[PDB]
């Protein structure tokens, strides 16, 4: 749990982070989908408990630079992310 792992639940493959889930879907319900119709909540076959699936931390990276004619130092901008989490 709590890290970027490749998982396979009853032939359902994926990659992400499995975390404890506070969702409370009824005992008969097995899977959990979302607004985009993707499985984000699952239940372990061995032990009947709820897990939330979150995609691993991704983001966009861009480079600030002056022209190479005058210098070659660069800076890095990580779009839309707090850098205490990189």
């Amino acid at each position: 749990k709590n890290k970027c792992v490749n998982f396979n639940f009853n032939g359902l493959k994926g990659t992400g982070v499995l975390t404890e889930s506070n969702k409370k879907f009824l005992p008969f319900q097995q899977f959990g989908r979302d607004i985009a119709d993707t499985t984000d909540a699952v239940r372990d076959p061995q032990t009947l408990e709820i897990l939330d699936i979150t995609p691993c931390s991704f983001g966009g990276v861009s480079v600030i630079t002056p022209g190479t004619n005058t210098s070659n130092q660069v800076a890095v901008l990580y779009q839309g992310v707090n850098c205490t989490e990189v």
Partner: peptide, 24 residues
């Protein structure tokens, strides 16, 4: 006041260069 969401698919919204305070 008269004028008024989590997409992992890869769609992002970039902030504008000019903040509302500068426009004001």
């Amino acid at each position: 006041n008269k004028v008024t969401a989590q997409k992992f698919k890869g769609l992002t919204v970039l902030p504008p260069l000019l903040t509302d305070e500068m426009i004001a």
